[PDB]
Amino acid sequence: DIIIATKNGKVRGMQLTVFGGTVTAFLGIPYAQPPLGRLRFKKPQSLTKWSDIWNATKYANSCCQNIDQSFPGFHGSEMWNPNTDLSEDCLYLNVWIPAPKPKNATVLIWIYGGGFQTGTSSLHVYDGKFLARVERVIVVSMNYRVGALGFLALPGNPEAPGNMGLFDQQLALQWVQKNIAAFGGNPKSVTLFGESAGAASVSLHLLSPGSHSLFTRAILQSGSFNAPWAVTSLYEARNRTLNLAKLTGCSRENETEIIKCLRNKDPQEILLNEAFVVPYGTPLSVNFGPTVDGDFLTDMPDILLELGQFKKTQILVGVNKDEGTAFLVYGAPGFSKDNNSIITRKEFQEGLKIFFPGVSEFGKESILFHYTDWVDDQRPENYREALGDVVGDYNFICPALEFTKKFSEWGNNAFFYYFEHRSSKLPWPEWMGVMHGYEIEFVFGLPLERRDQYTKAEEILSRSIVKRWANFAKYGNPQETQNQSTSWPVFKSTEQKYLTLNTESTRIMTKLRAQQCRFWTSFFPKV
Ligand SMILES: *[C@@H]1O[C@H](CO[C@@H]2O[C@@H](C)[C@@H](O)[C@@H](O)[C@@H]2O)[C@@H](O[C@@H]2O[C@H](CO)[C@@H](O[C@H]3O[C@H](CO)[C@@H](O)[C@H](O[C@H]4O[C@H](CO)[C@@H](O)[C@H](O)[C@@H]4O)[C@@H]3O)[C@H](O)[C@H]2NC(C)=O)[C@H](O)[C@H]1NC(C)=O
Ligand SMILES: *[C@@H]1O[C@H](CO[C@@H]2O[C@@H](C)[C@@H](O)[C@@H](O)[C@@H]2O)[C@@H](O[C@@H]2O[C@H](CO)[C@@H](O)[C@H](O)[C@H]2NC(C)=O)[C@H](O)[C@H]1NC(C)=O
Ligand SMILES: *[C@@H]1O[C@H](CO[C@@H]2O[C@@H](C)[C@@H](O)[C@@H](O)[C@@H]2O)[C@@H](O[C@@H]2O[C@H](CO)[C@@H](O)[C@H](O)[C@H]2NC(C)=O)[C@H](O)[C@H]1NC(C)=O
Ligand SMILES: COC(=O)c1c(CCCCC/C=C/CNc2c3c(nc4ccccc24)CCCC3)cccc1OC
Numbered sequence: 210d211i212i213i214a215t216k217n218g219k220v221r222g223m224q225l226t227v228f229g230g231t232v233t234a235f236l237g238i239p240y241a242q243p244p245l246g247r248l249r250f251k252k253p254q255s256l257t258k259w260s261d262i263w264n265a266t267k268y269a270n271s272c273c274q275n276i277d278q279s280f281p282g283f284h285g286s287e288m289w290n291p292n293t294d295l296s297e298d299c300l301y302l303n304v305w306i307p308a309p310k311p312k313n314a315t316v317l318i319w320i321y322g323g324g325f326q327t328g329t330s331s332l333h334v335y336d337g338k339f340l341a342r343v344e345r346v347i348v349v350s351m352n353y354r355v356g357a358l359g360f361l362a363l364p365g366n367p368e369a370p371g372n373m374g375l376f377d378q379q380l381a382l383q384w385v386q387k388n389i390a391a392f393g394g395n396p397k398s399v400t401l402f403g404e405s406a407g408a409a410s411v412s413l414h415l416l417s418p419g420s421h422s423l424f425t426r427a428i429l430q431s432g433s434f435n436a437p438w439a440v441t442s443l444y445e446a447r448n449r450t451l452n453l454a455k456l457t458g459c460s461r462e463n464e465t466e467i468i469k470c471l472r473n474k475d476p477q478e479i480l481l482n483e484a485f486v487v488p489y490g491t492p493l494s495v496n497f498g499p500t501v502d503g504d505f506l507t508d509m510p511d512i513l514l515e516l517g518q519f520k521k522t523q524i525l526v527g528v529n530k531d532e533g534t535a536f537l538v539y540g541a542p543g544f545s546k547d548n549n550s551i552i553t554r555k556e557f558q559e560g561l562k563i564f565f566p567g568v569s570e571f572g573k574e575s576i577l578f579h580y581t582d583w584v585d586d587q588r589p590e591n592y593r594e595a596l597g598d599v600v601g602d603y604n605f606i607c608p609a610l611e612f613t614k615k616f617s618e619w620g621n622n623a624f625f626y627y628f629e630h631r632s633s634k635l636p637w638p639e640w641m642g643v644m645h646g647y648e649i650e651f652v653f654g655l656p657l658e659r660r661d662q663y664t665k666a667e668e669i670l671s672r673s674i675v676k677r678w679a680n681f682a683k684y685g686n687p688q689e690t691q692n693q694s695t696s697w698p699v700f701k702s703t704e705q706k707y708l709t710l711n712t713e714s715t716r717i718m719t720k721l722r723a724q725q726c727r728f729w730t731s732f733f734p735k736v
């Protein structure tokens with residue numbers, strides 16, 4: 210057995226037999242007073258000491274959230290749904306310690322995605338026991354409030370200041386600063402990494418002053434704050450908010466007395482009116498997301514980025530080839546995961562009205578023009594594939610490149626990858642390609658378990674990805690030095706070189722999605 214003494218109490222973990230070795234997991238360590246009762250919506254009060262021995266041998270409650278039900282029984286979607294009881298009592302974290310206890314190990318802190326409305330650290334593909342065993346790092350992950358309960362914003366008023374889930378995250382980075390040396394980790398070598406909404410979170414920690422001391426560098430998988438869905442405005446924030454207030458019938462006008470009303474209301478009621486506070490949602494609507502609150506974020510993050518106001522350090526940034534496809538089957542007409550979704554011109558037209566609901570007629574035609582003077586004509590998948598590229602480029606790929614150009618313009622090393630491998634265990638049909646979020650399992654070293662059906666070449670790709678990620682965390686350079694591996698070159702905004710990840714080739718390419726991103730990041734925003 211193994212007990213570790215933390216700053217506010219003693220915690221017990223369990224031994225995990227992994228790959229002939231042993232990993233020590235501490236699942237479910239509380240890192241804040243439960244945000245309940247008179248504390249719902251408020252920032253996360255810090256946790257008072259205890260005298261027990263905390264039994265941290267199982268994942269804690271997942272935070273309250275709405276569950277995608279568009280594909281009941283289908284692993285490809287249900288893989289992402291929470292796998293622990295949902296409760297407001299839900300601010301806990303997990304620690305994966307290599308056995309035996311390391312001395313001064315690099316710490317990797319994972320932040321999950323979910324459009325700031327969903328997610329949980331318990332997910333199978335966020336299991337860090339593999340990273341602990343193989344590269345001898347410590348892996349930490351935490352639950353943070355999502356949806357309204359985590360991002361409702363009454364700008365100014367502290368019973369709902371906004372950004373609470375981000376402040377949840379931040380106090381957990383604070384926890385590994387005060388406590389991780391007790392686990393054999395090195396609080397001075399912490400790398401944050403996350404995917405999509407998690408990625409935008411960690412790009413926001415690169416901006417938020419209160420986080421600059423709590424980590425060393427950063428890895429942004431398929432997401433960044435300048436993506437169109439990441440930061441909801443301050444006026445559309447509290448327009449979203451008060452729309453909920455009338456739905457719940459909680460409209461006072463002592464601006465504070467609305468909040469007191471939303472706390473004698475039970476969590477399920479709040480969950481079920483979040484969908485309509487944006488009048489015309491899309492598959493990407495962050496109904497309640499990060500806002501400019503003047504505490505975590507003190508100014509519009511695009512300006513902080515444009516004028517070089519962030520933690521100076523190395524970033525590893527990247528995206529997947531078919532980021533957009535996952536969303537077309539969540540709404541778009543003529544699409545389904547059980548056929549090949551060949552849509553005509555007009556099906557595509559009506560599909561832009563769903564991803565661009567408040568965009569002018571001209572704007573929608575503008576997109577149709579850039580994306581359909583074809584490299585040629587026959588192929589009935591033209592509109593099907595154009596629409597997936599439209600969503601992927603606008604929502605993920607071009608924000609991420611634009612983040613990397615602008616970040617690296619202040620002298621820091623940047624590394625850009627481009628993941629283009631489709632898992633063969635992947636259960637979605639083949640026309641959807643390399644989908645949003647399906648690099649995560651390779652990053653976490655799941656293909657290294659041969660017992661769970663992955664190609665041998667898949668396990669090999671996972672093997673260098675993992676090594677590259679770890680060398681980046683520990684040494685700031687994401688190279689694979691030994692096995693005659695392609696060097697990963699630094700991303701300069703001059704030449705814009707990126708590395709491709711797949712089971713055939715590592716290749717160095719240049720100037721990713723050039724023609725498209727010049728449309729997206731300039732001609733298109735003026736409309
Ligand atoms: C936290 O966990 C520990 C151990 O859990 C371990 O976890 C997994 C991962 C593995 O490593 C396993 O080996 C472990 O299970 C818990 O420790 C248990 O503590 C209880 C305390 O009661 C033990 O129960 C028995 O203890 C005494 C021994 O003398 C008995 O006398 C007790 O029965 C008495 O109950 C009456 C009290 O009203 C008394 O009046 C009677 O005379 C009667 O004799 C009791 O049966 C238990 O044996 C321990 N576990 C093991 C495996 O031995 C710990 O409780 C956990 N804490 C939590 C969950 O909060
Ligand atoms: C800001 O809020 C108003 C009011 O919110 C409406 O009510 C909510 C419960 C929600 O379910 C939706 O009905 C609305 O968002 C919005 O005004 C609505 O606008 C739409 C068209 O945009 C119109 O059809 C509705 O009838 C309007 N409802 C009311 C009560 O006025 C408004 O659009 C929101 N956004 C902005 C930018 O102003
Ligand atoms: C691909 O599948 C979509 C899915 O719609 C189907 O609707 C059910 C009746 C049943 O057949 C299920 O397998 C699917 O969920 C098709 O979309 C429909 O198309 C018809 C006519 O084209 C139209 O009347 C429906 O309203 C459409 N429904 C939806 C949800 O889009 C689509 O036609 C299929 N395309 C190909 C090329 O196979
Ligand atoms: C960020 O993830 C979003 O989906 C998103 C939402 C999701 C909010 C509403 C739920 C709809 C489906 C959820 C299933 N959860 C999946 C996740 C991932 N990949 C999936 C791939 C296929 C099917 C389901 C997936 C990657 C990690 C997160 C969860 C709202 C607003 C913006 C968003 O993205 C900018």
Ligand SMILES: CC(=O)N[C@H]1[C@H]([C@H](O)[C@H](O)CO)O[C@@](O[C@@H]2[C@@H](O)[C@H](O)O[C@H](CO)[C@@H]2O)(C(=O)O)C[C@@H]1O
Pocket residue numbers: 270294296
């Ligand atoms: C409150 C919550 O969300 N989860 C509970 C958990 C279960 O989800 C619940 O019991 C429904 O099955 O139960 C927890 O533990 C119990 C002990 O607290 C109690 O003494 O009785 C059981 C003895 O083993 C049981 O262990 C748990 O299992 O962790 C508490 C947790 O918050």
Ligand SMILES: *[C@@H]1O[C@H](CO)[C@@H](O)[C@H](O)[C@H]1NC(C)=O
Pocket residue numbers: 312313395397398
């Ligand atoms: C851990 O490493 C830091 C430098 O990275 C060093 O200053 C510190 O003294 C070390 N402490 C332990 C306990 O290894």
Ligand SMILES: *[C@@H]1O[C@H](CO)[C@@H](O)[C@H](O)[C@H]1NC(C)=O
Pocket residue numbers: 463464465466
């Ligand atoms: C009412 O509004 C005032 C002014 O913002 C505030 O001080 C007070 O706490 C609010 N609530 C009550 C119950 O007075």
Ligand SMILES: *[C@@H]1O[C@H](CO)[C@@H](O)[C@H](O)[C@H]1NC(C)=O
Pocket residue numbers: 672673676692
């Ligand atoms: C490197 O190659 C050896 C065999 O020559 C293999 O056993 C090892 O796992 C490989 N490691 C990486 C990181 O590719």
Ligand SMILES: [Cl-]
Pocket residue numbers: 554
């Ligand atoms: Cl045509």
Ligand SMILES: [Cl-]
Pocket residue numbers: none
């Ligand atoms: Cl037309």
Ligand SMILES: [Cl-]
Pocket residue numbers: 727728732
């Ligand atoms: Cl253009």
